[PDB]
Write a protein that binds this ligand. Structure first.
Ligand SMILES: *Cc1cccc(-c2cccc(C*)c2)c1
Length: 14
C-alpha cells in the first residue's frame, strides 16, 4: 504494498 507500506518500507530501507 500500500502507499503507506511502500513509503514506510522506503524510509526503513526495505
Ligand atoms: C510490501 C510490504 C508488505 C508488508 C510490510 C512491508 C514493510 C513495511 C514497512 C517496513 C518494511 C521493512 C516492510 C512492506
Amino acid at each position: 504494498x500500500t502507499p503507506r507500506q511502500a513509503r514506510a518500507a522506503r524510509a526503513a530501507x526495505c
